[PDB]
Ligand binder design. Structure first.
Ligand code: DGD
Ligand code: CLA
Ligand code: CLA
Ligand code: PHO
Ligand code: LMG
Ligand code: LMG
Ligand code: LMG
Ligand code: LMG
Ligand code: BCR
Ligand code: BCR
Ligand code: LMT
Ligand code: MST
Ligand code: OEC
Ligand code: CA
Ligand code: CL
Ligand code: FE2
Lengths: 34, 82, 65, 114, 38, 57, 37, 37, 490, 35, 32, 341, 34
């Protein structure tokens, strides 16, 4: 339809970026010995 | 569980209390009553009496239209009333 | 630690760590400018809000050149 | 260290000083106006919203039979009979706007009885 | 003259009716006052 | 056709709506309080037009 | 100079200090009338 | 260089990951409509 | 170990890496500035300062650079609209260039201070452990600030050794960079007088220099050092933030209400100018004057400068717009091309009617026409069933004076109504909607965005203050509490 | 115990207690105004 | 394009749901 | 020791109603705010201000009464009793709505004092200040709505007037003019308040029906140990319950309780930002893609377009008596209306 | 200019996704005890 061109990338990076953040941590936590 | 104050319970029960407040309470009441019933309140707060919203004919509202000369403008609005 | 040229030259400025004046030091003197500032703001505030008018000071786009 | 770790699932004793809690809150307002009984605290905590929402639900279920809110339109009138508006009236105008515009083409008659 | 004498349960039921009376006067005032519609 | 006046209100994503506007629209007013199970329609096309999904939900 | 609104400012700036005054007066006084330890 | 003694390890438990993602995703479901406007 | 939201506490007492950090931040903020500049220079159109000035093109950084002097481009053009000018090195390109470099250097600096974190300067000779004498620091820094504050007002704004600042008349028509002389009188406290911005920095600068010295010499009264947990950097923060958000709530107010600091020729009109019909009155005043000096209606209105008419258009009112109505004001109504002219509406009787304007509050508003006394004479009806004032029944007509449509008249209802429908927004203009593929829905000016952003950040920062402050006065009880059962019984 | 009278609690209690009754009295009177 | 984006996020939240309910960290008693 | 420490001593003395340093600010204001309201509610009118009866004395009931905002002429004037407007006069002040900025500004300081109190009492009693952090939420609301908002508009006149009904029109207005319900921030707002009133109810019930037996009575209230020791309810049982009925369930009272602070405080913070934006009128009014399709195609209809029409009606039929200073005159023929109604 | 609308997002995810991959590993490796 007549939507915003950047809407897609704005939504994509809005979800990816912080999710990628959490994930990097969780996995590095998860793999700490002990 | 305590502080200096005399436990409300005791006071609300002391015949001294009532001997004092049976006088004081209705006192305050009858005062405020008169405050309204004597029309004094209307003047203390510039509040319109049932016969003072509009002039007899006029059906327009006394809307204050400018800050600085407001008080002055308000006074004139009282002028049309009567 | 690790001293350095600049590091030594600046060494004094940062050393008087916990050094405090005794008692109520300058407090009272401070509590006055503080009260003065408080009044100063209320003025410039009330001037902007046209609550305190001052012939000579016309708070509008006018009074401009 | 996360202040949360200070709790283990399956503890025997409590994890907070409900006596210190009450101590602070009792001083904020005043003692007898503060809870010290965790059970009475939690009952209130549940009772309040549930009771309030029960009424809200009964409101919609009640206004479902057209017993609506208070109608103070043109209540306060002056010495001659003129209508002196209250905020209740400014509310009526906003309501009329909604009435008069909803369901553009669905009405064929004067009164909205449906 | 202190120490509880006037029985509490009476202070209440009296101060109580006393409120239903004033608050009730208000409700009557609603069909007569200025807040009327007549 | 929520209001039974043949003036369809589309409320689904694929038909021009976004999360905030989109919705599942109520059964027709032509239907009122009548029960409208799928087996009450000549077809699904008819059922989707009178807001059948609403009741099923 | 010293316009009507300027006079009012003082009236309020003065009427304000007074309130702070009587308040801290009364307070500082009653404070120093009991607190034994 | 000397191993800086002010460092600690960082952690994010599984539950936090979930609570995190739930937040990111729903915010995204809430704002995407206005991004596409 | 550490929760995600605490990873930066690893610096609470590593003055070295704290500076390394603060250096990187400055690098990014400087970097951003440099490149936000280039972005505007790669998209800003200087072709017309009258009807398509920076504030119509969603320019945000470009204005702050003009307010202090930089008003030219190495490519030849200039903000005021002149040619042949030589901005020298300090052109928008120059400024943008500078920051990008200052950023690269601060970066390298951040790296060095990170690796060489254990400089002795941060260790207290006495305790031999990391420590920073805050009280003396504050004094030092405060000294430098006032010293710089002073210079800025003393040499920059005054023109002694600098450009000056943006100064314009009462209707943003003449604006430019000009040297401003101080002003210690009372009217120098008037937000709209440039002289006050000068005096302030000279006086406050000095007071700032004095006060710094004081704090470099006098030490903090024990009572205070204890109360305000000084010597605990996480308190320097709680107070700064409180100041930073105070500064913020203020800049947000001067941007919205206007001041010699947020000039309209650079940030755009005020919602309040439209409210009080500010520019509408300046136009009339002028038009009636020309008629006095015996000019014709055509001549009078034709004398009205386009720029002036443009400010009298609700489409430049920052109060119109939306939160997700992105971009420059041009993606809305379009790039302004020319002033169609003043529209005068009249009805069969010759009577002159007037179009009730659109209050900023209303997304959509009705077309109503009244005479001088405010009597409704004509309008555009909803339900025609019983319309008494349709433009048709009234023979409403429209005539123009000065501008594209000057000297022309229109009488076919539709065309008359079209323009009436436009009169609602104030002066009628000619937009180019193609280029930017505009949609015809109002968007707000930079003045508006800056104001929204700072009012939020400020209100958000308040929470930071309350948080960090608390965390300073309760450090002890942080992590939890312990024993006893004292409560009621002093 | 030997409790006092005029206390801080008392002051407060009256700042709200006294005006209230004065208002309840005022209002009770309004119920009769008309036109 | 928009529809796809809306459905995707939704599909992602439901996936989360699954993992959260069936792949949480078993909640252990006393010892910790 | 000294007058200060003696002044302190006295203040921080543990009474029935703790005073404290904070009180020196709290009580003066808090009482004046409450007082001014109660005064106007029964005595002052809003005639010269909004052409409205607004007090008991005029005939208003607890719902219709209110302390209405000042005229629009006043602008953002602080309207001080002794300022250029009222000029020291009291009655005039009343008629010019001086009582609004009075209640507003006073109550404002009163919320500062109160939060300070929490902070001060917390410190004394030696507990963490999370009761103060929490209260930032209500401050933000009051600040953004009763101050920041109207500060962005033409004047105090468009700030919410203090009163029950007088607040409902504030709501209706925001729908009609700002289409506020469609705002991402207002939504978060409600998700928090609504979601917060859930945790409240849900946690309460989970506790009362997951209790251990510590008494022989049915009324289990008395069976509680005011003096800690064991958990009074089976945290372990609660976990299993929800873990089987909802699929997810707490298991760390420390987190379960922090969550309860977070949810509603974050919600209110968001609802504030949304309004800080409505000040500049930077609203979330429309969806452009929708409007464009509605223009070209007359058969496209969503529950969104529908709403916008409701707004048009609200604005057209209200504006007149709601914005008196605009001397609006909307001929019957110009008033938007559907068929028959 | 007259480019592809998805070009931006195609390039963004083409860089982000695999970079986010490597990074998740490196950090989880890097934090493995001993
Ligand atoms: C935790 C939080 C705790 C908070 C505790 C708060 C305690 C006290 C708060 C005091 C608030 C004072 C508000 C003053 C004000 O509104 O003062 C307003 C006046 C400006 O007033 C307006 O001025 C307008 C007209 O401007 C126009 O007309 C003018 C001439 O009349 C000029 O020509 C001007 O150039 C032209 O544009 C109209 O006259 C308005 O009616 C009038 O109200 O000064 C000014 O604000 C100076 C303003 C400094 C503002 C700081 C603002 C902070 C946040 C702002 C958010 C805005 C959105
Ligand atoms: C800090 C203030 C600030 C301000 C006032 C502006 C203002 C402006 N910019 Mg700039 N900008 C900034 C910072 C700022 N910018 C930064 C840091 C960058 C780097 C990315 C840019 C990059 C930039 C570009 C590339 C462009 C602009 C343009 C513009 C103009 C845009 C009009 C618009 O569409 O706004 C839109 C405003 C919004 C969409 C704000 C909505 C925010 C909501 C959606 C989300 C908040 C986040 C999250 C969901 C909250 C949840 C929290 C949780 C706890 C619940 C405007 C004058 C444009 C221009 O010049 O056009 C001619 C342009 O092309 N800006
Ligand atoms: C102005 C300077 C300033 C500074 C130096 C700090 C510094 C700090 N804050 Mg603080 N804060 C501030 C302002 C500031 N704050 C404000 C205005 C608020 C109110 C919103 C808060 C609210 C706040 C809370 C609630 C907490 C802190 C905490 C902390 C500590 C966190 C350690 C960490 O690992 O961060 C971690 C940061 C992240 C993991 C990432 C955040 C990502 C999102 C939210 C934003 C991304 C933003 C984007 C990239 C750019 C933003 C630009 C900005 C201008 C808007 C740290 C010492 C924490 C603490 O006290 O720990 C002991 C804590 O719990 N702060
Ligand atoms: C609009 C509904 C609403 C009300 C009425 C309300 C009221 C109150 N909340 C308090 C507390 C709290 N509320 C909290 C979280 C929340 N509170 C919420 C919503 C509300 N909270 C929400 C949604 C949250 C979740 C974030 C917390 C965390 C606390 C506390 O710690 C505190 C408390 O102690 O709990 C009981 C009390 C603080 C007393 C005080 O500070 O006096 C000082 C100020 C005074 C006395 C007066 C000045 C205030 C001015 C602005 C008001 C003037 C108003 C007129 C008198 C009346 C207006 C008429 C109306 C019809 C408009 C107070 C009774
Ligand atoms: C002492 C310490 C007090 C501390 C805090 C006090 C807070 C007090 C709030 C008082 C609201 C009073 C309203 C009033 O008096 O109205 C008086 C009015 C006016 O009633 C009208 O009066 C007019 C003349 O003035 C005319 O006679 C009208 O016809 C008549 O209707 O109220 C009512 O009729 C009210 C019925 C109210 C039921 C209210 C429940 C309120 C519950 C509040 C909190 C509950 C927990
Ligand atoms: C008995 C008879 C039952 C008949 C049912 C008919 C349904 C018809 C739908 C239709 O025609 O839609 C036609 C529409 C609309 O298509 C849209 O139309 C618009 C104008 O109305 C515009 O032109 C849009 O651009 C266009 O995409 O549907 C689709 O495109 C549908 C794709 C549907 C995929 C459905 C998947 C269902 C999966 C179920 C379970 C999956 C696991
Ligand atoms: C002695 C005199 C020296 C004069 C130099 C003049 C250079 C003029 C360039 C010019 O006019 O470009 C005009 C052009 C072209 O601009 C483009 O023109 C095209 C048609 O030719 C199209 O219209 C494009 O859409 C448009 O963007 O330049 C720019 O837009 C430049 C933005 C430049 C930013 C430069 C930053 C340089 C930074 C250096 C170090 C940084 C750290
Ligand atoms: C408590 C919570 C408090 C929350 C406060 C929240 C936000 C305060 C925000 C202030 C914002 C100032 C924003 C300016 C935006 C702007 O100018 O956009 C400008 C752009 C450009 O917009 C285009 O401009 C063109 C002309 O140059 C044309 O006008 C186009 O039509 C127009 O669409 O618009 C947008 O970006 C909308 C963006 C929505 C973005 C969501 C991004 C999420 C990113 C997540 C991670 C990124 C990592 C990299
Ligand atoms: C404050 C309070 C309260 C209150 C209360 C009250 C106020 C009450 C009242 C009550 C009342 C007030 C009652 C009454 C009753 C009555 C009855 C029970 C009656 C009966 C009757 C009858 C039976 C009759 C008969 C008859 C007659 C008289 C005549 C002739 C005929 C006949 C025969 C019919 C309470 C406790 C809760 C709690 C605490 C607080
Ligand atoms: C090294 C070096 C160099 C260089 C440098 C450079 C080249 C740089 C660059 C830089 C840059 C290039 C930078 C940039 C930056 C940026 C930034 C910093 C950004 C930011 C952003 C943000 C922050 C965002 C956000 C947001 C969003 C997204 C939305 C909503 C709102 C907001 C705003 C929040 C030289 C040669 C000198 C030499 C030496 C060395
Ligand atoms: C106590 C705490 C007070 C805080 C501020 C008090 C301000 C008092 O301000 C002062 O009030 C008195 C009335 O009482 C005014 O006196 C004025 O009002 C009265 C009516 O009330 C008029 O009859 C009188 O002619 C007029 O001058 C002063 O002009 C004003 O400056
Ligand atoms: C245990 C702390 N005391 C306490 N007291 C009260 N009292 C009211 C009246 C707010 C329920 N509430 C709480 S929080 C549910 N806590
Ligand atoms: Mn959906 Ca209840 Mn307004 Mn008749 Mn239709
Ligand atoms: Ca009579
Ligand atoms: Cl319909
Ligand atoms: Fe609990």
């Amino acid at each position: 339809m007549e939507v915003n061109q950047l809407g897609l990338i704005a939504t994509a990076l809005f979800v990816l970026v912080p999710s990628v953040f959490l994930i990097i941590l969780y996995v590095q936590t998860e793999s700490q010995q002990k | 569980g305590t502080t200096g104050e005399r436990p409300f319970s005791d006071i609300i029960t002391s015949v001294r209390y009532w001997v004092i407040h049976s006088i004081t309470i209705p006192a305050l009441f009858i005062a405020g009553w008169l405050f309204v019933s004597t029309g004094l309140a209307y003047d203390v707060f510039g509040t319109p009496r049932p016969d003072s919203y509009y002039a007899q004919e006029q059906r327009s509202i006394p809307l204050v239209t400018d800050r600085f000369e407001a008080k002055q403008q308000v006074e004139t609005f009282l002028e049309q009333l009567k | 630690a690790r001293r350095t040229w600049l590091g030594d030259i600046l060494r004094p400025l940062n050393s008087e760590y916990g050094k405090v004046a005794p008692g109520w030091g300058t407090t009272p003197l401070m509590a006055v400018f503080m009260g003065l500032f408080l009044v100063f703001l209320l003025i410039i505030l009330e001037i902007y809000n046209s609550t305190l008018i001052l012939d000579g000071v016309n708070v509008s786009w006018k009074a401009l050149g | 260290e996360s202040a949360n770790y200070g709790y283990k699932f399956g503890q025997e004793e409590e994890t907070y000083n409900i006596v210190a809690a009450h101590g602070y809150f009792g001083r904020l307002i005043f003692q007898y106006a503060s809870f010290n009984n965790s059970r009475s605290l939690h009952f209130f905590l549940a009772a309040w919203p549930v009771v309030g929402v029960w009424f809200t639900a009964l409101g919609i279920s009640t206004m479902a039979f057209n017993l609506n809110g208070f109608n103070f339109n043109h209540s306060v009138i002056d010495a001659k009979g003129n209508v002196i508006n209250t905020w209740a009236d400014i509310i009526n105008r906003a309501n009329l706007g909604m009435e008069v515009m909803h369901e553009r083409n669905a009405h064929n008659f004067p009164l909205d009885l449906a | 003259s202190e120490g509880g004498r006037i029985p509490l349960w009476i202070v209440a039921t009296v101060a109580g009716m006393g409120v239903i009376v004033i608050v009730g006067l208000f409700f009557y005032g609603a069909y007569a006052g200025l807040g009327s519609s007549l | 056709d929520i209001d039974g006046i043949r003036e369809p209100v589309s409320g689904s994503l694929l038909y021009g709506n976004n999360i905030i506007t989109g919705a599942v629209v109520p059964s027709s007013n032509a239907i009122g309080l009548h029960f409208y199970p799928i087996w009450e329609a000549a077809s699904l096309d008819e059922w989707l037009y009178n807001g059948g999904p609403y009741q099923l939900i | 100079t010293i316009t009507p609104s300027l006079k009012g400012f003082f009236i309020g700036l003065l009427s304000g200090a007074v309130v702070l005054g009587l308040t801290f007066a009364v307070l500082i006084a009653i404070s120093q009338i009991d607190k034994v330890q | 260089m000397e191993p800086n003694p002010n460092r600690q390890p960082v952690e994010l438990n599984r539950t936090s990951l979930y609570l995190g993602l739930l937040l990111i995703l729903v915010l995204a479901l809430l704002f995407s409509s206005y991004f596409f406007n | 170990g550490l929760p995600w939201y605490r990873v930066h506490t690893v610096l609470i007492n590593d003055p070295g890496r704290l500076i390394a950090a603060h250096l990187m931040h400055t690098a990014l903020v400087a970097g951003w500035a440099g490149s936000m500049a280039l972005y505007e220079l790669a998209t800003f159109d200087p072709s017309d300062p009258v009807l398509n000035p920076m504030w119509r093109q969603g320019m945000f950084v470009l204005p702050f650079m003009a307010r202090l002097g930089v008003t030219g481009s190495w490519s030849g053009w200039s903000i005021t609209g002149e040619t042949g000018i030589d901005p020298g090195f300090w052109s928008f390109e120059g400024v943008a260039l500078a920051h990008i470099v200052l950023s690269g250097l601060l970066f390298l600096a951040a790296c060095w201070h990170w690796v060489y974190w254990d400089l002795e300067l941060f260790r207290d000779p006495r305790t031999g452990e990391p420590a920073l004498d805050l009280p003396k620091m504050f004094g030092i820094h405060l000294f430098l600030a006032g010293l710089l504050c002073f210079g800025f007002g003393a040499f920059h704004l005054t023109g002694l050794f600098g450009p000056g600042m943006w100064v314009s008349d009462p209707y943003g028509l003449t604006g430019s960079v000009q040297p401003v002389a101080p002003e210690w009188g009372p009217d120098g406290f008037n937000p709209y007088n440039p002289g006050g911005v000068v005096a302030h920095h000279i006086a406050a600068g000095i007071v700032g220099i004095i006060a710094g010295l004081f704090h470099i010499l006098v030490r903090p009264p024990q009572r205070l050092y204890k109360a305000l947990r000084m010597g605990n950097i996480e308190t320097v923060l709680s107070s700064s933030i409180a100041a930073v958000f105070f500064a913020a709530f203020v800049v947000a107010g001067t941007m919205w209400y206007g001041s010699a600091t947020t000039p309209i020729e650079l940030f755009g009109p005020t919602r309040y100018q439209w409210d009080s019909s500010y520019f509408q009155q300046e136009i009339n005043r002028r038009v009636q004057a020309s008629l006095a000096s015996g000019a014709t209606l055509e001549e009078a209105w034709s004398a009205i400068p386009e720029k002036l008419a443009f400010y009298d258009y609700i489409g430049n009112n920052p109060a119109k717009g939306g939160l997700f109505r992105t971009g420059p004001m041009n993606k809305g109504d379009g790039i302004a091309q020319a002033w169609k002219g003043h529209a005068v509406f009249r009805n069969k009787e010759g009577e002159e009617l007037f179009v009730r304007r659109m209050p900023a509050f209303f997304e959509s508003f009705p077309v109503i026409l009244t005479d001088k006394n405010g009597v409704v004479k004509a309008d555009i009806p909803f339900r025609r069933a019983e319309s008494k004032y349709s433009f048709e029944q009234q023979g409403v007509t429209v005539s123009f004076y000065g501008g594209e449509l000057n000297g022309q008249t229109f009488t076919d209802p539709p065309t008359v109504k079209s323009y009436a429908r436009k009169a609602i927004f104030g002066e009628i203009f000619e937009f180019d909607t193609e280029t930017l593929n505009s949609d015809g829905i109002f968007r707000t000016s930079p003045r508006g965005w800056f104001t929204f952003a700072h009012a939020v950040f400020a209100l958000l920062f308040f929470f930071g203050h309350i948080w960090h402050g608390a965390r300073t006065l309760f450090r002890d009880v942080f992590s939890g509490i312990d024993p006893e059962l004292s409560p009621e019984q002093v | 115990v030997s409790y006092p009278i005029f206390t801080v609690r008392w002051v407060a209690v009256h700042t709200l207690a006294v005006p209230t009754i004065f208002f309840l009295g005022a209002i009770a009177a309004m119920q009769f105004i008309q036109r | 394009m928009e529809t796809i984006t809306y459905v995707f996020i939704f599909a992602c939240i439901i996936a989360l749901f699954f993992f959260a309910i069936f792949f949480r960290e078993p909640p252990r008693i006393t010892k910790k | 020791r000294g007058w200060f420490d003696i002044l302190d001593d006295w203040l921080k003395r543990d009474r029935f109603v703790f005073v404290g340093w904070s009180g020196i600010l709290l009580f003066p204001c808090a009482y004046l705010a409450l007082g001014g309201w109660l005064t106007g509610t029964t005595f002052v009118t809003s005639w010269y201000t909004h052409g409205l009866a607004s007090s008991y004395l005029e005939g208003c009931n607890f719902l219709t009464v209110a302390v209405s905002t000042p005229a629009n002429s006043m602008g953002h004037s602080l309207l001080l009793l002794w300022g250029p407007e009222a000029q020291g006069d009291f009655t005039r002040w009343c008629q010019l709505g001086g009582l609004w900025t009075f209640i507003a500004l006073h109550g404002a300081f009163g919320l500062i004092g109160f939060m300070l109190r929490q902070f001060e009492i917390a410190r004394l009693v030696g507990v963490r200040p999370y009761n103060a952090i929490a209260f930032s939420a209500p401050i933000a609301v009051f600040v953004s709505v009763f101050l920041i908002y109207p500060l962005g508009q033409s004047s105090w006149f468009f700030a919410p007037s203090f009163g029950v009904a007088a607040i409902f029109r504030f709501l209706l207005f925001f729908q009609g003019f700002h289409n506020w319900t469609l705002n991402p921030f207002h939504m978060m707002g409600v998700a928090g308040v609504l979601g917060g009133a859930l945790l409240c109810a849900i946690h309460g019930a989970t506790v009362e029906n997951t209790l251990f037996q510590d008494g022989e009575g049915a009324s289990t209230f008395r069976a509680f140990n005011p003096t800690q020791a064991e958990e009074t309810y089976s945290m372990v049982t609660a976990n299993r319950f929800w873990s089987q009925i909802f699929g997810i369930a707490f298991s760390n009272k420390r987190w379960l309780h922090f969550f309860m602070l977070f949810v509603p405080v974050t919600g209110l913070w968001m609802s504030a930002i949304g309004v800080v934006g409505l000040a500049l009128n930077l609203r979330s009014y429309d969806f452009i893609s929708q409007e464009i399709r509605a223009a070209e195609d007359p058969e496209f209809e969503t529950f969104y377009t529908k709403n916008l029409l409701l707004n048009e009606g609200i604005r057209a039929w209200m504006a007149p008596q709601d914005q008196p200073h605009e001397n609006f005159v909307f001929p019957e023929e110009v008033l938007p209306r559907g068929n028959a109604l």
